[PDB]
Amino acid sequence: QVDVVVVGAGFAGLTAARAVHEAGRSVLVLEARDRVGGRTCTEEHHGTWIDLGGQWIGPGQDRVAALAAELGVETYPQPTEGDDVVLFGDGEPQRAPDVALAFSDEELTAYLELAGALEAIAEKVPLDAPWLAPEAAAWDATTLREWVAGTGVPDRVAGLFEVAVQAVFAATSAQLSLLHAAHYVHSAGGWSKLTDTEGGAQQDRLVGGVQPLAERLAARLPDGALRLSTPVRGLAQDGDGVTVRTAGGEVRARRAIVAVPPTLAGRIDHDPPLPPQRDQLLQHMPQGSVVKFHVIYDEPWWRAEGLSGTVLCPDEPIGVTFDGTPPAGTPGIVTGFFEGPAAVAAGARTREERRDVVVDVLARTLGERARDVRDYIDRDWSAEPWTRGCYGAHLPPGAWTVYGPALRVPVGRVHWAGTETAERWTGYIDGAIESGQRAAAEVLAALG
Amino acid sequence: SEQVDVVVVGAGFAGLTAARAVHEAGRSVLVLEARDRVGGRTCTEEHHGTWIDLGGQWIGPGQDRVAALAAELGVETYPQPTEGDDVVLFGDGEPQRAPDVALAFSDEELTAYLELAGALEAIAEKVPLDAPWLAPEAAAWDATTLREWVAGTGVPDRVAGLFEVAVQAVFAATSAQLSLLHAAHYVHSAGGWSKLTDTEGGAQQDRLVGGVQPLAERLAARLPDGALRLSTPVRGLAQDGDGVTVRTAGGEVRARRAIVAVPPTLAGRIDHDPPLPPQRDQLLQHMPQGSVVKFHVIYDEPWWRAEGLSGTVLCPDEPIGVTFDGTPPAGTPGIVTGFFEGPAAVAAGARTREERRDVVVDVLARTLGERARDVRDYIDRDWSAEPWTRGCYGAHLPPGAWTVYGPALRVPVGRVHWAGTETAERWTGYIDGAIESGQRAAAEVLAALG
Ligand SMILES: *Cc1cc2c(cc1C)nc1c(=O)[nH]c(=O)nc-1n2C[C@H](O)[C@H](O)[C@H](O)COP(=O)(O)OP(=O)(O)OC[C@H]1O[C@@H](n2cnc3c(N)ncnc32)[C@H](O)[C@@H]1O
Numbered sequence: 001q002v003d004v005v006v007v008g009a010g011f012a013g014l015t016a017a018r019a020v021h022e023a024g025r026s027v028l029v030l031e032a033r034d035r036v037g038g039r040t041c042t043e044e045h046h047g048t049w050i051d052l053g054g055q056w057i058g059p060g061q062d063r064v065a066a067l068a069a070e071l072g073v074e075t076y077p078q079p080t081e082g083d084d085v086v087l088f089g090d091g092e093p094q095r096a097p098d099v100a101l102a103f104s105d106e107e108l109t110a111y112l113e114l115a116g117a118l119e120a121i122a123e124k125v126p127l128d129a130p131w132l133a134p135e136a137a138a139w140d141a142t143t144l145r146e147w148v149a150g151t152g153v154p155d156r157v158a159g160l161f162e163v164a165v166q167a168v169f170a171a172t173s174a175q176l177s178l179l180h181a182a183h184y185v186h187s188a189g190g191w192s193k194l195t196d197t198e199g200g201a202q203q204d205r206l207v208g209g210v211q212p213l214a215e216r217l218a219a220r221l222p223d224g225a226l227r228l229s230t231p232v233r234g235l236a237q238d239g240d241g242v243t244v245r246t247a248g249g250e251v252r253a254r255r256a257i258v259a260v261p262p263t264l265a266g267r268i269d270h271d272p273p274l275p276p277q278r279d280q281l282l283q284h285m286p287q288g289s290v291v292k293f294h295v296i297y298d299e300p301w302w303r304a305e306g307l308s309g310t311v312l313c314p315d316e317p318i319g320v321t322f323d324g325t326p327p328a329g330t331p332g333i334v335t336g337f338f339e340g341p342a343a344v345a346a347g348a349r350t351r352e353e354r355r356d357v358v359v360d361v362l363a364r365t366l367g368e369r370a371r372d373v374r375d376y377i378d379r380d381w382s383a384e385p386w387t388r389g390c391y392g393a394h395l396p397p398g399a400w401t402v403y404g405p406a407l408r409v410p411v412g413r414v415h416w417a418g419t420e421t422a423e424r425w426t427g428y429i430d431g432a433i434e435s436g437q438r439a440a441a442e443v444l445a446a447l448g
Numbered sequence: 449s450e451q452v453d454v455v456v457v458g459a460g461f462a463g464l465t466a467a468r469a470v471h472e473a474g475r476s477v478l479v480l481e482a483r484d485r486v487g488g489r490t491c492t493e494e495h496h497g498t499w500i501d502l503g504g505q506w507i508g509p510g511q512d513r514v515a516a517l518a519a520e521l522g523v524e525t526y527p528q529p530t531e532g533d534d535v536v537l538f539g540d541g542e543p544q545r546a547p548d549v550a551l552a553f554s555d556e557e558l559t560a561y562l563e564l565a566g567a568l569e570a571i572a573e574k575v576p577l578d579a580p581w582l583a584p585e586a587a588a589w590d591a592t593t594l595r596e597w598v599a600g601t602g603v604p605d606r607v608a609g610l611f612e613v614a615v616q617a618v619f620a621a622t623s624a625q626l627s628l629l630h631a632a633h634y635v636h637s638a639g640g641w642s643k644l645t646d647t648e649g650g651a652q653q654d655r656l657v658g659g660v661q662p663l664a665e666r667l668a669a670r671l672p673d674g675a676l677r678l679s680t681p682v683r684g685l686a687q688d689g690d691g692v693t694v695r696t697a698g699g700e701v702r703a704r705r706a707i708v709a710v711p712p713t714l715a716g717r718i719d720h721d722p723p724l725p726p727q728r729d730q731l732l733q734h735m736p737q738g739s740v741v742k743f744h745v746i747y748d749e750p751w752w753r754a755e756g757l758s759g760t761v762l763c764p765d766e767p768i769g770v771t772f773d774g775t776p777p778a779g780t781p782g783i784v785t786g787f788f789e790g791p792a793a794v795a796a797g798a799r800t801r802e803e804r805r806d807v808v809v810d811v812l813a814r815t816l817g818e819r820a821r822d823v824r825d826y827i828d829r830d831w832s833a834e835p836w837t838r839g840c841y842g843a844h845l846p847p848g849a850w851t852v853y854g855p856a857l858r859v860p861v862g863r864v865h866w867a868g869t870e871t872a873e874r875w876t877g878y879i880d881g882a883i884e885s886g887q888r889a890a891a892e893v894l895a896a897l898g
Pocket residue numbers: 007008009010011012013030031032033036037038039040052053054055056057230231232233259260261264268290292381386387389390391392417418419420427428429430432
């Protein structure tokens with residue numbers, strides 16, 4: 001019987017396991033995949049790292065910043081300079097020093113007032129208990145889309161805001177409750193923190209990619225602790241401990257920390273079954289929909305044209321793109337996303353069909369040299385059986401106030417982690433780390 | 449390991465309908481059921497010398513499949529009691545007695561309610577029963593909650609309130625939880641708002657003598673000996689070019705094709721190899737089951753009948769929104785049947801049976817009167833706590849789900865085919881829709897085998 005069994009070796013499970021080990025307790029980590037990192041995933045292609053999962057850290061994300069500094073992983077800045085390209089519907093592409101300058105003063109004022117309005121709501125939502133917001137009932141009953149419509153902002157501003165919503169939530173404004181979106185904005189420290197590159201969540205990358213940071217963290221565990229390729233099928237508990245069922249047999253422990261996405265936590269055979277409010281909460285926490293891609297070129301040829309590599313095309317299937325080129329300056333990479341409905345449509349198509357869509361958008365925005373592609377690498381996170389959607393869960397109307405209170409409450413000897421349980425930077429690697437710290441502290445207090 | 453033509457996962461009305469059709473066509477079939485019984489979301493226990501339907505209990509006009517099955521397997525109906533005054537307790541004032549609930553409304557209020565129901569029906573009729581995502585205004589209707597749509601109509605507070613009781617009694621979910629497209633499809637599927645809400649002429653018209661689970665047991669008895677395997681949950685479904693391997697705790701079954709006839713949330717929990725395609729997996733994540741606690745309060749006699757009361761109370765601002773006289777034809781014991789729905793179900797499900805009883809008796813004392821405290825017994829079931837259901841009556845879809853994920857609802861994945869009331873075109877959410885789905889999935893499998 002080990003003291004603690006952790007299910008899942010993403011940042012949340014690995015943080016929890018390391019904290020349990022450092023306190024002197026025995027720990028086993030059972031991970032379904034043949035690797036650690038979870039929703040972070042890095043592969044070597046073209047002599048450089050390709051982050052198919054989470055890749056950015058930014059100011060305010062102090063847990064992941066501290067971890068990278070502890071484990072010796074350096075950052076490099078997301079490129080910010082050069083003209084952005086904005087394309088509306090059947091128009092011509094417009095170069096602007098920033099995306100914002102493609103809109104009128106009146107449109108930018110309306111967008112800033114709308115974001116400010118959402119921030120002032122967000123500040124009222126308690127980070128550990130969004131269901132305790134004074135207006136929780138009203139705000140849980142309303143979609144974000146209905147709230148945006150009630151502000152009376154013009155179509156164009158609502159459209160621009162929708163690009164930002166889909167980029168942050170991997171879901172449309174109709175899928176999300178206002179209370180969910182408000183909590184998420186509060187959790188990040190504001191709308192600028194979510195959407196800015198400089199000063200926000202897209203500010204910095206990790207030299208070598210993010211999966212190797214998760215691997216350095218896993219290397220702080222003793223040999224024998226990590227069990228890869230070992231999906232957890234069942235989790236039983238009684239008065240003396242827990243029993244984890246895998247295909248290859250059973251693990252006995254005193255307490256468990258389940259650190260997987262909510263939809264996957266619900267699929268484990270729990271004995272006794274989970275209490276109904278918790279089971280139904282997991283039924284109301286669907287993962288987002290995103291296909292993440294990197295377009296590889298021999299060089300970042302757009303830079304010589306004075307272009308950033310960022311394109312904003314609200315009527316195309318892809319979201320905002322980014323210059324993904326490493327510090328070496330080759331290969332040239334354009335990074336982007338299919339989000340929400342567009343990701344579900346794209347996920348039903350082949351890689352080559354997705355490639356063709358992306359290259360056509362880039363040819364029309366960055367220029368005809370976009371067609372001379374060396375490689376196209378993507379990942380539909382909804383097709384990953386051990387994730388079933390990025391970036392993370394969202395809650396539809398009515399879920400936070402009725403089912404949400406079951407989010408973090410331990411069920412006997414079974415404690416919960418994962419970025420969806422974080423108070424701050426929920427949905428991000430930083431929040432995953434928070435959740436693993438919190439769950440470990442719960443378990444260590446319970447064993448004592 | 450055993451080899452059969454078809455394995456059916458689940459012995460609810462959908463699974464059993466499918467298995468019987470496959471058997472009667474001459475194919476070998478096994479039915480693997482998790483529970484120690486058949487009937488699934490229908491469940492009957494004997495108490496106080498009569499049947500207690502803890503799950504689905506009513507059938508109505510227009511539900512032709514369940515009516516044909518009951519007739520075929522020799523299960524008689526009895527009518528839901530209709531006579532006596534209903535009691536309506538609004539958010540303000542004393543309880544009001546009326547021969548029908550609608551008489552508790554003002555004329556302005558009743559006109560507004562019928563105009564709201566008519567407007568919903570006009571949208572509903574435009575929603576194709578086989579493909580709600582092909583509605584002309586599908587994107588707009590899928591992007592709006594039913595509640596937002598109601599708010600836009602400008603009806604009076606008492607009208608929104610009584611409409612909300614009906615919404616929660618039909619969907620086991622609040623109007624904020626449901627997309628307008630989902631609600632409109634459900635109304636079309638049933639044949640209109642009256643079909644869903646009426647007793648005479650609607651879904652609550654008739655009961656089955658002896659309860660519903662015996663009907664499922666008679667349908668199971670049409671299978672050959674050894675076909676039904678109870679207390680055998682399916683954990684895994686692996687498939688290749690030639691068949692499917694079904695994994696249970698102790699063994700495996702090999703089949704040419706499978707029909708999975710379980711609630712959507714539980715279908716997604718089976719270990720699929722290869723993994724399910726992403727649209728389907730994410731659809732199941734967007735098909736949460738409802739929240740209901742169904743109860744029966746037992747009295748020695750239906751004493752309310754002697755006071756000229758029907759036993760029905762309607763309370764928009766109470767944890768129990770609606771009740772019915774559940775007394776059997778013999779006339780004893782007296783039964784008051786009702787529901788905690790939606791948020792009230794989740795709140796109630798976190799409390800004990802005795803705590804729920806005391807909430808029910810509190811509401812009944814204030815509406816039917818003092819004799820409501822003279823309880824012989826109280827029997828209830830939180831369907832959200834049932835590990836092999838995880839919520840009644842069935843799934844609903846939140847905004848944005850039907851248009852983006854919905855198209856994956858019925859499409860087979862290789863040799864794995866889908867049944868269940870949630871896949872029915874007509875009377876989806878009901879026993880009648882379960883039977884439809886089972887007939888459809890059996891015909892699909894038989895066509896695909898040859
Ligand atoms: C997918 C993605 C995510 C992402 C993003 C882009 C994409 C395409 N961009 C981000 C970014 O730039 N910066 C950032 O901070 N976050 C970004 N995100 C989100 C981020 O990746 C996640 O918030 C974070 O990685 C989540 O960590 P957490 O530890 O909570 O969850 P996980 O990584 O999913 O780990 C769960 C592990 O559990 C294993 N698993 C699942 N089920 C089982 C069972 N049954 N048995 C055993 N193991 C299981 C998974 O394999 C996984 O390793």
